[PDB]
Amino acid sequence: SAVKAARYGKDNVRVYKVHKDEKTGVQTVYEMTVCVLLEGEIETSYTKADNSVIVATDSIKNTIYITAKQNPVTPPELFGSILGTHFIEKYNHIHAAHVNIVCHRWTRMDIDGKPHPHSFIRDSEEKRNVQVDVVEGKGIDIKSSLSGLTVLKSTNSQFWGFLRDEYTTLKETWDRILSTDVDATWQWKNFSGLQEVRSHVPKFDATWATAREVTLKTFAEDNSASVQATMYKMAEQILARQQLIETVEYSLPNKHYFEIDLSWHKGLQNTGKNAEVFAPQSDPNGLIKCTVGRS
Amino acid sequence: SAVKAARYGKDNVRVYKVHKDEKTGVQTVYEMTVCVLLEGEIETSYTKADNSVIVATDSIKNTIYITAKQNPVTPPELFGSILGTHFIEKYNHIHAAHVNIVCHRWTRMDIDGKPHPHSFIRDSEEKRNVQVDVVEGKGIDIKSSLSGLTVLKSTNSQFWGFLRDEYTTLKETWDRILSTDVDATWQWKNFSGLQEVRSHVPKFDATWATAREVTLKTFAEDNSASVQATMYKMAEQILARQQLIETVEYSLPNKHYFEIDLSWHKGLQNTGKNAEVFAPQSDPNGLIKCTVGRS
Amino acid sequence: SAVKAARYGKDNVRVYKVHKDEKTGVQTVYEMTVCVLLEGEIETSYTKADNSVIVATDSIKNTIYITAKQNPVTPPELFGSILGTHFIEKYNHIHAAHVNIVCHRWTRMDIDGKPHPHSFIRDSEEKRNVQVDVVEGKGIDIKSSLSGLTVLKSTNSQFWGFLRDEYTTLKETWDRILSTDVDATWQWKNFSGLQEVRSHVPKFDATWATAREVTLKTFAEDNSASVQATMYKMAEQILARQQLIETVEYSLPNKHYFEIDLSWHKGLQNTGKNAEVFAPQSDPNGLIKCTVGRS
Amino acid sequence: SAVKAARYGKDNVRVYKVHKDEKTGVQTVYEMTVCVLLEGEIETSYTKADNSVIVATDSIKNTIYITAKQNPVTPPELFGSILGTHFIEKYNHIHAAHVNIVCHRWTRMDIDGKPHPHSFIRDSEEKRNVQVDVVEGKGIDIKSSLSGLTVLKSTNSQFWGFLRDEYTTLKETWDRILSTDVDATWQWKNFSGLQEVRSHVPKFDATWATAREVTLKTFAEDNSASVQATMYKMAEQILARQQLIETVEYSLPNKHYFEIDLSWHKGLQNTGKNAEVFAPQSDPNGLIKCTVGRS
Ligand SMILES: O=c1[nH]c(=O)c2nn[nH]c2[nH]1
Ligand SMILES: O=c1[nH]c(=O)c2nn[nH]c2[nH]1
Ligand SMILES: O=c1[nH]c(=O)c2nn[nH]c2[nH]1
Ligand SMILES: O=c1[nH]c(=O)c2nn[nH]c2[nH]1
Ligand SMILES: [Ar]
Ligand SMILES: [Ar]
Ligand SMILES: [Ar]
Ligand SMILES: [Ar]
Ligand code: NA
Ligand code: NA
Ligand code: NA
Ligand code: NA
C-alpha cells in the first residue's frame, strides 16, 4: 500500500476580533470559524510513525490567533491568503495550505435611528465564506461564497412543459410558491501570490455585495419558468459585472409548499386560485445545481 | 396504578398562509409551527383500550388547517385562542386545550429601496411564540415570547464584587464582552374567553414590539453590572408600559468570549487593554433567569 | 416591580472521569453534561447591582470538577445529590440547588469476543438523565429518566374505534407501523438528605435497568391498541417493581410511516396487505403523554 | 456565458421497506435516505426555459419508490446501481446518474435472549453509505462508506516527537485520551455495468463488515503513535483483505479531552499520572485525512 493523498490540520477554530477607533469610539467586531489543512512531504507520519514532519494541529490553532492579531481579518479572501501563504513560506516540507473561513453576521444595532458604537445583532444565519488554496509554485486559488440566504416568493413562479411519462404524477402549474436556500460561489482567476491578492482587495467586498444584490433582485423580479432558468439569469449577471471571476456556481434546494385539499370538509375551497393555506414540506426537496463560465 | 395526568395531540404542524390584497396586488405570508395538546375525560384510552374518547391526532392536524383557512392567523395570541376554544366547545369530554405556536420570520424584501409585493427573506432565526392554555371554566391564559434574539456588545459590560472563596478563580473585570440569546416571556392577565381576547387584539403586536425595543435599547445602553442587573431593568420597563401583563420572565445564557494570552509568542500583547483577538466558547455557558411581577 | 423567582448558574458543563483498576488494568469511563442552577437570597444582584450575593457561575463550574474528582460520579442520582447538597451547606444564603445530569453512553468494546480493558464505543444517542432538586428543609427530590431510545415495530400495532366526525379523514387500521422515541421519567419518594440517598444507592442502577427492560419488552410484545394503551402497561409494571417510585411519566412521539399508493403506475399494489414500501414522515408527529401514580 | 456543468434531482427522499417471511413470520426492515442527481443534455432548461428536457424531480421521487417496490434494497451498492442504470437506460438525453444512499440502523431487538420477529431498535447514529455514479459508456463507480462511528480509548495513545518552533505550546505526551468519529470510504474497481455489480453482490456486505471490524480492532489494539499512524494501519489491512477495492480513505477528527489543573484548590492532584477528571472540548478539533492505494 502507498499514501495517495494526505491532508491534516485544525477545524472549527472560532475567532473573534474587535477593532476600536480611538477618535470616534466606534467598535467593529468580526467573528469567523476557520479550518486550515496542510499537505506536503508528510507521508512518513502515516507510514513510519515519524512525527518530525508534523506541524502539530495545536500549533496551527495558535498560528491562526497570532495571524489574526497581526493582520486585518477583512476581507476574508485577504486573511485566508495571508494565513495560507504563512504555512508554505515557514515550513520547507509543506507545499499546500487549504483555508476555509465562515464569517458570522454581527450587524451594528440601530437604537432610536442612530448606529450604536459597540452593540451588534445576529441578523440571520446567512454566512459569507471563502475557500483559499495556496499551492507552492501554483499561486492562490480563491472561491468566495454566500450561503444560508433563505427566500420565498408567494407567486410569479411557474413550472410547466416538463417531460411526462408513466413515472409522472406532477401537475403543470402557472402559479406556485418558490422558496430556496441560496448557496452561490464565485471562483476568482488564479492569483500569482499575496501581492496580487492585495492589489485587488477592494473588489472582494464589492463582488460579494453585487452577488447578493443580483441574487435577491433576480429572484424577486423574474417570472420564473423554473429554478434552472432563474438561477442561470443570476449567474450570467454576476459574470458580466466582475471580469476577474471565471465561474459562478449555484446550488439551490426547491423547498416545496403543498396545496391542502379541504373540499372533504363542508366543500371548503383551498386549491388553485382559492389556495390560502399550504403545508410546508420538510423533505424531500429538489436540488438544482449549475456552474456558469465564460464562452 | 391510576392516571394522574394525561395529554395528547399533534406536534410540529407546519402551516403557511398567504393574504392577497386584490386592490394593491400586495401579498403577505405567515408561516408557523403549531402544537395542540388536549386534556379531559380520556383516562379509559390508557387504562381500558377505549379509543371512543380519542379525537385522533390526525383530526387535530386537519382542524389546525381548517381553522387557519377560516380565521386570521395574526396576531398569534388570537389564532391560538380561537384554536384552543374550538376543541373545548366542540368536544363535551375535552376540558383543556394547550396551543403552542412558533412564528417564523418572512420579512418583505426591499428591491431598489421599494418594498416588493410578493418576495420575502428570512432575516434571522428569531421567533415570536405563544403558549395558549384554554381551560373549561377558567378562561384563557396566554404567554407571549420572543426567542432566538442573539446580540453582542464589545464593551460597557463589567463583572466585579462577586463572592470570592476557595472555589473562585475568576478575575474581576471592568470591561468585557457580553453576548446572549434572549428568551423573554410576558404573561397576560387571565382572559374570560374569546370575546375578551378579541377586545385586546391591538395590544398583542404592540406589546411584542415594545418588549423587543426595550430589550435591544436596554442591552445597548446599560453599563451592565451583571446579566442579572441588566435583565431586571428590561423586565421593569415592559411591566411599566403594558398594564395587562402580570409577569415578565427572562432566560439569558452568558456566551463567554475568552481572552487569549499570546505573550509566550515574541511578547505579543493581547490581554486587558491590549485584547483584540478572543476565543468564543461554545460551552459551558452561564444561565441567568428571573421572573419579575408587580409589587 | 418585584423579583418573583430567580435562579442562575452554569449549563452545558461537559465532564469526563476515568476509573483505573490497578489490579486488573481495566479502565471505566464516565461522560456527562451537567447543569447547576441556584436559588436563594440573591434578589439584590438583580435589583441593586449587589454582586456580593453571587457565587460566580465560573466558580460553580470549578465546583463541579472538584466534586467529580473527590466523589463517585455513578450512580448519577448520588453524584447529583452530593453536588446539590454542597451548595446549600457551603453558602448560608443559597436555599435550593437544581442539578441536571445527562449521561452519555461509552460502552466497552468486545474485540474477538473479549471485553477490551480501555476501548469504548458510543452505541446510540440514548441518554440516562437525572434531575435533583435539593431544597433547604425539604430534602432531596430526584427524577430519573431515559431518553433518546428509538424503536420501531413493523406489525402488531392497531388503531381503530376512535371518534369520527366532520374533521376526521383517518382510516381505521388493524395493522400499522409503530415507531417512537421513548422519554420515560420515574420520580422517587422524597429523601430526607444525603444519608438516605446513600442508603438506597443500589436501587438507582437496578430501577434504570428495570425501566429500560419493561419499556422494550412491553413495546415488542404488546398487540398495541394505541400508544396510550401500550404506554400505560409500561408505567403500571415499573410502579409494581419499585415501591420507592411515586410516579412514572412517559412522553412518546408517534413517528408516522405512510403507505404509498403506486396503483397509478402499471397497477402496482403497495397498500393494505400488499404494503412493502412506505414514506417515513419527518413531521407532523403525534405526541402522547401520561403520568401514572399509585391508587 | 455558457453552462460548464449542471446536475439536478431530488434529495432527502426517505424510504422504508419491509420484508415478510411467510414461513417463519420474521419481518426485516430497511430504512434509507436517497438522493438522485442527473446530468445530460439539459443545458436548454437553464438557458432557454426549455422544460421539455426536464425529468421532473417529483418523477425522480416516484421512480425511487417504484424501484424499491420492484427490486431488493440490499445491499445498497446493488440498489444504487439499479436506480442509476434505470435513468440512463430510460432517458436518451440523460448520460449520468449520481445516487447517494444513507442506510439507517434498525437492529432486531433481543427480548429474553431471543431475537424478536418484528421489533427493532436504533442502536447508534452510525450509517452505512454508498455513492454510485452511473455514466453512459464509462460503467459504474461505487464508493462505499461507514460514518458516525464514535469511539474513545482512555490510554494507549501517545503523541511526541512533533515539530517544535516559536508557534508550539503543545507538551509531548506518552499517555492521552484518543476519541474520534470514524468516516471510512472504500472505492471499488470500476464495474462495466449491472451484470458485473450483480456478480459481486456477496462481497459488498462482507467488505463493509471487514472494514468495520478492522477499524474497531486496530483502534482498540494499536499503541497509537498518532492518529496518522493508526489510520494508515487500518487502511493497509482493508486493502489486503479485498482485492476489488482500489483505495481506502479515512477522515478522522481528533476530539480533544483536556486535563484540568485543580492544584489551585487545596493542592488537588489531577494532572499527568493523577489525571482522573477531564474537560471534553467541543471545538476546535484536529482533522486528519488520508487516501491509501496500491503500490
Ligand atoms: O494524533 C495527532 N496528530 C496530530 O497531527 C496532532 N497535532 N496535535 N495533536 C495531534 N495528535
Ligand atoms: O396510537 C395512536 N393514538 C392516537 O391518539 C392517534 N391519533 N391518530 N393516530 C393515533 N395513534
Ligand atoms: O453577569 C454575570 N453574572 C454571573 O452570575 C456571573 N458569574 N460568572 N460570570 C458572571 N457574569
Ligand atoms: O423548478 C423546478 N425545477 C425542476 O426541475 C422541477 N421538478 N419538479 N419540480 C420542479 N421545479
Ligand atoms: Ar431561483
Ligand atoms: Ar443582558
Ligand atoms: Ar408505545
Ligand atoms: Ar485513530
Ligand atoms: Na514550503
Ligand atoms: Na368541553
Ligand atoms: Na444554605
Ligand atoms: Na441515456
Coordinates of C-alpha atoms in Angstrom, one line a residue, chain C residues 28-267:
Chain C
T28 CA -14.0 2.5 33.0
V29 CA -15.0 5.9 31.6
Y30 CA -18.0 8.2 32.5
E31 CA -19.0 11.2 30.5
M32 CA -21.8 13.6 31.4
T33 CA -23.2 17.1 30.8
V34 CA -24.1 19.0 33.9
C35 CA -26.2 22.0 34.7
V36 CA -26.4 23.6 38.2
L37 CA -28.8 26.4 39.0
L38 CA -29.0 28.0 42.4
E39 CA -31.8 29.9 44.2
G40 CA -31.8 31.8 47.5
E41 CA -31.3 35.3 48.9
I42 CA -30.0 36.8 45.6
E43 CA -32.7 39.3 44.6
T44 CA -30.3 42.3 45.3
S45 CA -28.0 41.2 42.4
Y46 CA -30.9 41.9 40.1
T47 CA -32.4 45.0 41.8
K48 CA -29.4 46.8 43.3
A49 CA -26.4 45.6 41.3
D50 CA -25.2 43.8 44.5
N51 CA -22.8 41.2 43.2
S52 CA -21.7 40.2 46.9
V53 CA -24.5 37.6 46.9
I54 CA -23.4 35.9 43.6
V55 CA -21.4 32.7 43.7
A56 CA -19.9 33.2 40.2
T57 CA -21.1 30.8 37.5
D58 CA -17.4 30.2 36.8
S59 CA -17.0 29.0 40.5
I60 CA -20.0 26.7 40.0
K61 CA -18.1 25.2 37.0
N62 CA -14.9 24.7 39.2
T63 CA -17.0 23.1 41.9
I64 CA -18.5 20.6 39.5
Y65 CA -14.9 19.4 38.5
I66 CA -13.7 19.4 42.1
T67 CA -16.8 17.4 43.3
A68 CA -16.3 14.9 40.4
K69 CA -12.6 14.5 41.5
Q70 CA -13.4 13.8 45.2
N71 CA -16.6 11.6 44.8
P72 CA -18.1 8.8 42.8
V73 CA -19.9 10.1 39.6
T74 CA -22.1 7.0 39.5
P75 CA -24.9 6.4 40.0
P76 CA -25.8 9.9 38.8
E77 CA -28.6 10.2 41.4
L78 CA -25.9 10.1 44.0
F79 CA -23.5 12.5 42.3
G80 CA -26.3 15.0 41.7
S81 CA -27.4 14.7 45.4
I82 CA -23.7 15.3 46.6
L83 CA -23.3 18.3 44.2
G84 CA -26.7 19.9 45.2
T85 CA -26.1 19.4 48.9
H86 CA -22.6 21.0 48.7
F87 CA -24.1 24.4 47.6
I88 CA -26.9 24.6 50.3
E89 CA -24.3 23.6 53.1
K90 CA -21.5 25.8 51.9
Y91 CA -23.5 29.1 51.2
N92 CA -25.8 30.4 54.0
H93 CA -27.9 32.5 51.6
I94 CA -28.4 29.7 49.0
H95 CA -31.5 27.7 49.8
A96 CA -32.0 25.5 46.7
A97 CA -29.8 23.8 44.1
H98 CA -31.1 22.3 40.9
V99 CA -28.9 19.7 39.3
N100 CA -29.5 18.3 35.8
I101 CA -27.1 15.5 34.6
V102 CA -27.2 13.9 31.1
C103 CA -25.1 10.7 31.0
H104 CA -23.6 9.8 27.6
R105 CA -23.0 6.1 26.6
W106 CA -19.5 4.8 26.5
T107 CA -20.0 1.0 26.1
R108 CA -16.9 -1.2 26.4
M109 CA -15.8 -2.7 23.1
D110 CA -15.8 -6.5 22.5
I111 CA -12.7 -7.4 20.4
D112 CA -12.6 -11.1 19.3
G113 CA -15.4 -11.9 21.8
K114 CA -13.5 -10.5 24.9
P115 CA -14.2 -7.1 26.7
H116 CA -11.4 -4.6 26.0
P117 CA -9.8 -3.0 29.0
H118 CA -9.8 0.6 27.8
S119 CA -11.7 1.0 24.5
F120 CA -15.3 2.2 24.2
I121 CA -18.0 2.9 21.6
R122 CA -20.9 5.3 21.6
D123 CA -23.7 2.7 20.9
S124 CA -26.6 5.2 20.4
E125 CA -27.6 8.6 21.5
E126 CA -29.8 7.1 24.2
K127 CA -29.2 9.1 27.5
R128 CA -29.7 8.4 31.1
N129 CA -30.6 11.6 33.0
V130 CA -31.3 12.9 36.4
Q131 CA -32.9 15.9 37.8
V132 CA -32.0 16.6 41.5
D133 CA -33.7 19.4 43.5
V134 CA -32.0 19.9 46.9
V135 CA -34.1 22.4 48.9
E136 CA -33.1 23.6 52.5
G137 CA -35.5 22.0 55.0
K138 CA -37.4 20.0 52.3
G139 CA -34.8 17.2 51.5
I140 CA -33.9 15.9 48.0
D141 CA -36.3 15.3 45.1
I142 CA -34.9 13.0 42.4
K143 CA -36.4 12.4 38.9
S144 CA -34.5 9.7 36.9
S145 CA -35.1 9.3 33.2
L146 CA -34.1 7.6 30.0
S147 CA -34.5 9.5 26.7
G148 CA -33.5 9.1 23.1
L149 CA -34.5 5.3 22.9
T150 CA -35.7 5.0 19.3
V151 CA -37.7 1.8 18.4
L152 CA -39.9 0.6 15.6
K153 CA -42.2 -2.4 15.2
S154 CA -43.4 -3.4 11.7
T155 CA -46.7 -5.0 12.7
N156 CA -48.8 -5.8 15.9
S157 CA -50.0 -2.2 16.2
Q158 CA -53.6 -1.3 15.6
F159 CA -55.7 1.9 15.8
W160 CA -59.4 1.7 15.3
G161 CA -62.6 2.7 17.2
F162 CA -61.6 6.4 17.6
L163 CA -64.1 9.4 17.4
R164 CA -65.2 10.1 13.8
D165 CA -66.8 13.5 12.9
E166 CA -66.6 16.0 10.1
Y167 CA -62.9 16.7 11.0
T168 CA -61.9 13.0 10.6
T169 CA -60.2 11.6 7.5
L170 CA -58.0 8.9 9.2
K171 CA -58.9 5.3 8.2
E172 CA -59.2 2.7 10.9
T173 CA -56.4 0.1 10.8
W174 CA -55.7 -3.3 12.2
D175 CA -52.0 -3.4 11.1
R176 CA -49.6 -0.4 11.1
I177 CA -46.0 0.5 11.8
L178 CA -45.4 2.0 15.3
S179 CA -42.2 3.9 15.9
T180 CA -41.4 6.3 18.8
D181 CA -38.6 7.9 20.7
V182 CA -39.1 6.9 24.4
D183 CA -38.8 9.6 27.1
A184 CA -39.6 7.9 30.5
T185 CA -39.2 9.5 33.9
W186 CA -39.6 7.9 37.3
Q187 CA -40.0 10.2 40.3
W188 CA -38.5 8.9 43.7
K189 CA -40.1 9.4 47.1
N190 CA -38.7 12.5 48.7
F191 CA -35.4 11.7 50.5
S192 CA -34.6 13.4 53.8
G193 CA -30.9 14.1 52.9
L194 CA -27.7 12.6 51.6
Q195 CA -27.6 9.8 54.2
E196 CA -31.0 8.4 52.9
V197 CA -29.9 8.8 49.2
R198 CA -26.7 6.8 50.1
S199 CA -28.8 4.1 51.8
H200 CA -30.7 3.4 48.5
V201 CA -27.6 3.6 46.1
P202 CA -28.1 0.0 44.7
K203 CA -31.8 0.7 43.7
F204 CA -30.8 3.5 41.3
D205 CA -29.0 1.4 38.6
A206 CA -31.4 -1.5 39.2
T207 CA -34.5 0.7 38.6
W208 CA -33.0 2.2 35.4
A209 CA -32.3 -1.3 34.1
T210 CA -35.9 -2.4 35.0
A211 CA -37.5 0.7 33.4
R212 CA -35.5 0.0 30.2
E213 CA -36.2 -3.7 30.1
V214 CA -40.0 -3.1 30.8
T215 CA -40.2 -0.5 28.1
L216 CA -38.5 -2.7 25.4
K217 CA -40.4 -5.9 26.3
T218 CA -43.8 -4.3 26.5
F219 CA -43.3 -2.4 23.2
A220 CA -42.1 -5.6 21.5
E221 CA -44.8 -7.9 22.9
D222 CA -48.0 -5.8 23.2
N223 CA -50.5 -6.1 20.4
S224 CA -50.9 -2.4 20.7
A225 CA -54.4 -0.9 20.7
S226 CA -52.9 2.6 20.7
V227 CA -49.8 4.4 22.0
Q228 CA -52.0 5.4 25.0
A229 CA -52.8 1.8 26.0
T230 CA -49.2 0.4 25.5
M231 CA -47.6 3.2 27.5
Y232 CA -49.9 2.7 30.4
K233 CA -48.9 -1.0 30.5
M234 CA -45.2 0.1 30.7
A235 CA -45.9 2.5 33.6
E236 CA -48.0 0.0 35.6
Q237 CA -45.2 -2.6 35.5
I238 CA -42.4 -0.1 36.6
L239 CA -44.6 1.1 39.6
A240 CA -45.2 -2.6 40.6
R241 CA -41.4 -3.4 40.6
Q242 CA -40.1 -0.5 42.7
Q243 CA -42.0 0.7 45.7
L244 CA -39.8 3.8 46.3
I245 CA -41.1 5.3 42.9
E246 CA -44.2 7.6 43.3
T247 CA -44.9 8.3 39.6
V248 CA -43.9 7.3 36.1
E249 CA -44.3 9.7 33.2
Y250 CA -44.0 8.8 29.6
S251 CA -43.8 11.2 26.6
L252 CA -43.9 9.4 23.3
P253 CA -44.0 10.8 19.8
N254 CA -45.9 8.8 17.2
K255 CA -43.5 8.9 14.2
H256 CA -45.7 8.2 11.2
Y257 CA -44.9 6.0 8.3
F258 CA -47.3 6.5 5.4
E259 CA -48.4 3.9 2.8
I260 CA -47.6 5.0 -0.8
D261 CA -50.3 4.3 -3.4
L262 CA -48.4 3.2 -6.6
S263 CA -51.6 1.9 -8.4
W264 CA -51.3 4.9 -10.9
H265 CA -48.1 3.1 -12.2
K266 CA -49.0 -0.1 -14.1
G267 CA -51.5 -1.1 -11.3

